[PDB]
Structures are given as C-alpha cells and as structure tokens.
Write an enzyme that holds these catalytic residues in place. Structure first.
Site, PDB file in Angstrom:
ATOM      1  N   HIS A  81       0.842  -1.224   0.000  1.00  0.00           N
ATOM      2  CA  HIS A  81       0.000   0.000   0.000  1.00  0.00           C
ATOM      3  C   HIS A  81       0.867   1.261   0.000  1.00  0.00           C
ATOM      4  O   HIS A  81       0.312   2.368  -0.035  1.00  0.00           O
ATOM      5  CB  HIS A  81      -1.069  -0.006   1.106  1.00  0.00           C
ATOM      6  CG  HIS A  81      -0.568   0.083   2.504  1.00  0.00           C
ATOM      7  ND1 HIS A  81      -0.886  -0.889   3.444  1.00  0.00           N
ATOM      8  CD2 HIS A  81       0.218   1.001   3.127  1.00  0.00           C
ATOM      9  CE1 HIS A  81      -0.275  -0.591   4.576  1.00  0.00           C
ATOM     10  NE2 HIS A  81       0.427   0.557   4.403  1.00  0.00           N
ATOM     11  N   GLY A 117       2.420   5.928  10.400  1.00  0.00           N
ATOM     12  CA  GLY A 117       3.851   5.818  10.046  1.00  0.00           C
ATOM     13  C   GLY A 117       4.493   4.532  10.539  1.00  0.00           C
ATOM     14  O   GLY A 117       5.669   4.285  10.197  1.00  0.00           O
ATOM     15  N   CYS A 162       3.608   1.501   9.655  1.00  0.00           N
ATOM     16  CA  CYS A 162       3.427   0.396   8.662  1.00  0.00           C
ATOM     17  C   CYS A 162       4.801  -0.124   8.209  1.00  0.00           C
ATOM     18  O   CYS A 162       5.718   0.693   7.978  1.00  0.00           O
ATOM     19  CB  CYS A 162       2.569   0.812   7.471  1.00  0.00           C
ATOM     20  SG  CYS A 162       0.826   1.095   7.897  1.00  0.00           S
TER      21      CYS A 162
HETATM   22  C1  LIG Z   1      -0.742   4.683   2.107  1.00  0.00           C
HETATM   23  C2  LIG Z   1      -1.796   5.522   2.819  1.00  0.00           C
HETATM   24  C3  LIG Z   1      -2.862   5.946   1.813  1.00  0.00           C
HETATM   25  C4  LIG Z   1      -1.120   6.758   3.418  1.00  0.00           C
HETATM   26  C5  LIG Z   1      -2.469   4.737   3.918  1.00  0.00           C
HETATM   27  C6  LIG Z   1      -2.093   3.431   4.213  1.00  0.00           C
HETATM   28  C7  LIG Z   1      -2.705   2.718   5.223  1.00  0.00           C
HETATM   29  C8  LIG Z   1      -3.717   3.311   5.974  1.00  0.00           C
HETATM   30  N1  LIG Z   1      -4.400   2.628   6.992  1.00  0.00           N
HETATM   31  C9  LIG Z   1      -5.718   2.175   6.551  1.00  0.00           C
HETATM   32  C10 LIG Z   1      -5.619   0.805   5.931  1.00  0.00           C
HETATM   33  C11 LIG Z   1      -4.554  -0.054   5.672  1.00  0.00           C
HETATM   34  C12 LIG Z   1      -5.039  -1.233   5.072  1.00  0.00           C
HETATM   35 CL1  LIG Z   1      -3.817  -2.546   4.657  1.00  0.00          CL
HETATM   36  C13 LIG Z   1      -6.412  -1.398   4.820  1.00  0.00           C
HETATM   37  S1  LIG Z   1      -7.123   0.077   5.412  1.00  0.00           S
HETATM   38  C14 LIG Z   1      -3.905   2.410   8.243  1.00  0.00           C
HETATM   39  O1  LIG Z   1      -4.494   1.661   9.029  1.00  0.00           O
HETATM   40  C15 LIG Z   1      -2.609   3.101   8.669  1.00  0.00           C
HETATM   41  C16 LIG Z   1      -2.335   2.964  10.165  1.00  0.00           C
HETATM   42  C17 LIG Z   1      -1.647   1.850  10.654  1.00  0.00           C
HETATM   43  N2  LIG Z   1      -1.415   1.697  11.967  1.00  0.00           N
HETATM   44  C18 LIG Z   1      -1.817   2.589  12.881  1.00  0.00           C
HETATM   45  C19 LIG Z   1      -2.493   3.729  12.462  1.00  0.00           C
HETATM   46  C20 LIG Z   1      -2.884   4.683  13.396  1.00  0.00           C
HETATM   47  C21 LIG Z   1      -3.560   5.824  12.968  1.00  0.00           C
HETATM   48  C22 LIG Z   1      -3.832   6.018  11.610  1.00  0.00           C
HETATM   49  C23 LIG Z   1      -3.440   5.067  10.672  1.00  0.00           C
HETATM   50  C24 LIG Z   1      -2.755   3.923  11.089  1.00  0.00           C
HETATM   51  C25 LIG Z   1      -4.118   4.611   5.676  1.00  0.00           C
HETATM   52  C26 LIG Z   1      -3.495   5.323   4.659  1.00  0.00           C
END
Ligand SMILES: CC(C)(C)c1ccc(N(Cc2cc(Cl)cs2)C(=O)Cc2cncc3ccccc23)cc1
Ligand SMILES: CC(C)(C)c1ccc(N(Cc2cc(Cl)cs2)C(=O)Cc2cncc3ccccc23)cc1
EC number: 3.4.19.12
Lengths: 306, 305
Positions: free
Chosen positions: A41, A143, A145
């Site tokens: 992603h 951040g 991920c």
């Molecule tokens: C790259 C882009 C657009 C930027 C992006 C990438 C991933 C996210 N997400 C949502 C999702 C990931 C998945 Cl796999 C399915 S939904 C997340 O869950 C990121 C995330 C991971 N861990 C903790 C989090 C805590 C807060 C907010 C987001 C978090 C959102 C935007």
C-alpha cells in the site's frame, strides 16, 4: 524470581530497518540481503486505498520512483515485484548487518516481539500474541506500517509479522513476510471488523505454571478433570478448546512443578466458575493469556541469545 | 492507537555486554571505551557474602584473576579499581561498538529499560520503574548480576541501573553506574527487606490521560478536588503524595486532553472508591503506575531515535 512481559533483544532487527518513500507516502521496510520488504500500500494515495488495483498501480512505477533510506544513506532500487500484499524492492547493496533469518507463519496463540518504527528508525520494542481472531493488540501510530514482528530461536531471527493496518476497534492486522494476511482482512479502505475473540487456554495454563514457579499456589486444589469435562466447562467461558497436543506441550512445566496438566486444568475450571475472590496471580486480577509455554520456560530457565 | 509497556530498542546496549569471571563466580559486565563495569561482589565466595571486606578481598587479586569474555574474544585486564559497589576493569582494547553514553541517577517513579543477561549474552528486554521504596519488580535469575538499566535520548544511552541482588519478597536492588545503591541496601547476604511499597500517583494520572487520548473516558466524573483533599484520600489507599511539581509535569497532557489535573485527580479518587466494576482501562483491571508522563507523550506522539 519475577515474571515480566519480555521482548527478545531487538539488535539484529534494528540493523534491518529502512525508510521507503513513494510519492508523499513514507513507511518502514525490512532490508535483508539485496531486497527491501514493505507493505504494497506504499504505492497508494488516500484516494487509491478505497478500491486499489495493485497490478496496475505498480506497472506505472519505475525503480527511481521509490526512495529507500538506510539511516541517512541512500540505497538505489534496481528492481521491484509483488508477493501477495508485500512489495520487494531489489537494491544495489546487500545489507552487511543481515542476520541468519527465516520467514515463519505463526499459529493463533503464538507470541512475538514487535520493533515499532517511524521513518525507518526504531522507537521501541514490546511482546504481542496473535489472537484467535488473527488480530494483535499493539501500539502503532500513523507511520508504523512495515514495523516487523520476530522470534529469536538459537542464532536465527524468525520474522513472522509485518504491520499493515489499524481496525476501527483499535486492534491491528498484518501479514507474514510472504505477504499473506493473518485473518480475513484485505489492504483496502473498506468496512472490516475483528471477529469475536476467545481466550488462549494453553497460554493461561502456562501462566498458572509461571505463578506456581514464582511461589503463588493459592489456586491449586484437590480436584481433577478429564480433558473432555474441562473443555465442556471452558467453552462456556469463551476459552479455546484444549487439545492433547496442548497437554503434551505443557509436559515440561508439569514435570518442573510436579502438578499434572489435568490438575492445573481442574484449578482453572474452579477459577472460571468462582472467580479470584478479589485475589491476584503474578500481580494481575485477570487470567493472562499472552505467555506461551515456551515463553514461561525461556524466562524461568534463563535461556540467552548471542 | 493502542498503548503497551514499551522498552527502548536494546541494540546499543547489546554491543556492550561481556562475561566477567573471578574464581567460580561468573556474571555480566558493561564494556564502554577501555573499561568494564560489574558488581564488586564478583570477587566474593558464598562464605565471603555475610560480612565481606571488599578493600581486603580486592588487594589480594591480580589482573589475570579476572577473565573478561566479549563473545569468543578474551579481553586482557591491565588494571582494576573500585568505586563504591562497582568494579572497574581497565582492558587493553576500547569497545569499537561503544555508543554515546552518560551515567545518570534516576528518582523513584522514573522508568527505564532492562537488558536481562546471562554469561554476557542478552536473554530479554523489559520496561521497569524505580519503586518509591527504591526496589524494582524485575525478572532476574542467578547469573543476571551486572544486567543494566538504560534510557535512550537521541543517539545517547543514559545508564541508570546495574543489578546486584534479589530481596526475600522477590523484588530487586542495584546501583547507579557510580556504584551507589538505590535505597538503604548493601552488598551483604545480611537480612534486609524492602520498605512498604506505595503506588506512584503521578504515573497513574499519566496513564489515565493515555486512556483518554486513546478514546476511553468512562471513568471521568463531574467533580474536582483540592490537592490537599486528593492527598488525604489517596494516602488511605497507599498512594504517594502528589506535589505541585507532579501537577506541573502533567501540564502538557492536561492541555492536550482539556482535562484539568485536579479533575483527573477527582476521577482517580472515585476509581479507588468504586474499582472498575468488571471494566478495564487500556486492557488492565488494575491502575497501572509504571508509565511516566514523558512515557505517555513519547508513545502517543511516536518519538524515534
Ligand atoms: C498509504 C496511505 C494511503 C497513506 C495509507 C495506508 C494505510 C492506511 N491505513 C488504513 C488501511 C490499511 C489497510 Cl492494509 C487497509 S485500510 C492504516 O491503518 C494506517 C495505520 C496503521 N497503523 C496505525 C495507524 C494509526 C492511525 C492512523 C493510521 C494507522 C491509511 C493510509
Ligand atoms: C558472589 C556469589 C557468592 C556467587 C553471589 C553473589 C550474589 C548473590 N545474591 C545475594 C546477594 C547480592 C548482594 Cl549485592 C547482597 S546479597 C543474589 O541475590 C544473586 C541473585 C540476583 N538476582 C536474582 C537471583 C535469583 C535467585 C538467586 C540469586 C539471585 C548470591 C551469591
């Protein structure tokens, strides 16, 4: 004496963390030999995440669209492919700090250490369990991920988890390092919910043995039970079924304490039926299920990693 | 989101752990530049431990009576001195993996990471608090002595703890890296006991703010309290006094959440009065006191190294 939630020392994995940037998206990658692994992603915009076609998104990128930083030293990408939900960036340099490693897919109930990372820098380390609903209760912020989960067995790092997403209940979902998701989840922004979670019975028993080894014995009793009779009671309290394999795995702890597995099962049966009566076990008012039998043996017998 | 007991990455400290042997006694040392730090009780027999004279025991040793191993590499001892309860072994080689470091003494209530070690090999890492009675609730087995506690700020490792002993309740005592024991404890197998332990009030409040930041507010109430009325109540549950300094340190978390410190104090009073009623806060059925206000900010604002 003493019993603590204990992570593996993070040093061999610290050597492998890098920052991967694609557009305005920055997350963590895992640099082993001449390959960097990260969630696919990374190639997605916020609008892309609603219904992404990863084949089509990747086809449009060249090697030079991916910025990989290893500390503050740039790695040149010379290739890219996808394995399930992970991106593999081939780089010009093999990681000199690459440890002996395997990619392992763990079963629900198994534990691992997480090195939480932001911008390819390690922030901190903690111990986790794969819940029976295939989620983990982690501490991850925007951040995180590409943060990895690992077990260190003898001289070899076993990578079992990569972080991809946070579910709306605040629990976390990710993949093995071959890009296969734990649980029925997808890398798209869509309605996804953790299933009903259950207690990891074999781990609660392991933790009761830890309590006995640390001199806490008030819950032991004169009663016994058959496996079958234990499982008929335990299932009523949303406990995972206890198998003969579970019983055999608890063999070493049974031998060390002189308490038969089915006698400890009888103790747990009464704890589920009666509660604790305002008493505690290893400084907990609830029955802890995030220590495996191996975790209890490792911490109570002082096994080291070199 | 989420909130977990989190240790600092242990890599920079893993580089510094060595095995020190003197006679039949093997424990852990800390190799920085051309010095190895370890507990001075390494020079003691079991019989020596009741009333050791360390000046007298040390003056009888030669450099070559100390075997220092860094993995497979024998380090040659070219000198030894004693500073309070730590031995300093001068070695022929500076540690190439020596990080930027400082020796700091921490206050009761402050947290740090422990790298638990056996035979100079790391077993495991966990987060600890210096209890108000100057003990730590650790996980240490015979052979753990010389295991170190540390905080990492930027690239700099601040070493605050070295493990020396287990007390009869199963809690642990040790020194700063200048060899000064935390608390009234001594390196003798003489009978010594942990004082009555208390809950670290400012940390419980910090953790309640963490729970709010993670979207849980069930425990809040319409009430406030004076500092004095809070302390008269909380002392009856064996909680540390909350000082004005504690209130000021909670300023940033109060500002971020919009919950006044004394309002959160009012919430804590009712939690002690009522318990949880079969609910949890950040997955705990007890009030957690091993997270500092800085720990809550670090983990809720995603600080890296
Ligand atoms: C790259 C882009 C657009 C930027 C992006 C990438 C991933 C996210 N997400 C949502 C999702 C990931 C998945 Cl796999 C399915 S939904 C997340 O869950 C990121 C995330 C991971 N861990 C903790 C989090 C805590 C807060 C907010 C987001 C978090 C959102 C935007
Ligand atoms: C050197 C010799 C004989 C070898 C030696 C050295 C130290 C110990 N002790 C006892 C004491 C240390 C201090 Cl300081 C005062 S008593 C310990 O407490 C060791 C220890 C530390 N941590 C956890 C322990 C758990 C179990 C048993 C002993 C533990 C005993 C023998």
């Amino acid at each position: 004496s003493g019993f603590r939630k204990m992570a593996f020392p993070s040093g061999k994995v610290e050597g492998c963390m890098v920052q991967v940037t694609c557009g305005t998206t920055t997350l963590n990658g895992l640099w082993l030999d001449d390959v960097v692994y990260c969630p696919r992603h990374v190639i997605c915009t916020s609008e892309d995440m609603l219904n992404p076609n990863y084949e089509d998104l990747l086809i449009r990128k060249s090697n030079h669209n991916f910025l990989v930083q290893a500390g503050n030293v740039q790695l040149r990408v010379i290739g890219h492919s996808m394995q399930n939900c992970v991106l593999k960036l081939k780089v010009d340099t093999a990681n000199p700090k690459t440890p002996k490693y395997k990619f392992v897919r763990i079963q629900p109930g198994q534990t691992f250490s997480v090195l939480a990372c932001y911008n390819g820098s390690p922030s901190g380390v903690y111990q986790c369990a794969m819940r029976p609903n295939f989620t983990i209760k982690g501490s991850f912020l925007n951040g995180s991920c590409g943060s990895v989960g690992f077990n260190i067995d003898y001289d070899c790092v076993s990578f079992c988890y990569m972080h991809h997403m946070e579910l709306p209940t605040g629990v976390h979902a990710g993949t093995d390092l071959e890009g296969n998701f734990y649980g029925p989840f997808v890398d798209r922004q869509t309605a996804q919910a953790a299933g009903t979670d259950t207690t990891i019975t074999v781990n609660v028993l392991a933790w009761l043995y830890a309590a006995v080894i640390n001199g806490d014995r008030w819950f032991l009793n004169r009663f016994t039970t058959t496996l079958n009779d234990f499982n008929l009671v335990a299932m009523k309290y949303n406990y995972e079924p206890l198998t003969q394999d579970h019983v055999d795995i608890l063999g070493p702890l049974s031998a060390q304490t002189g308490i038969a597995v089915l006698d400890m099962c009888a103790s747990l049966k009464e704890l589920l039926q009666n509660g604790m009566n305002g008493r505690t076990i290893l400084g907990s008012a609830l029955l802890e299920d995030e220590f495996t039998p191996f975790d209890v043996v490792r911490q109570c017998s002082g096994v080291t990693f070199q």
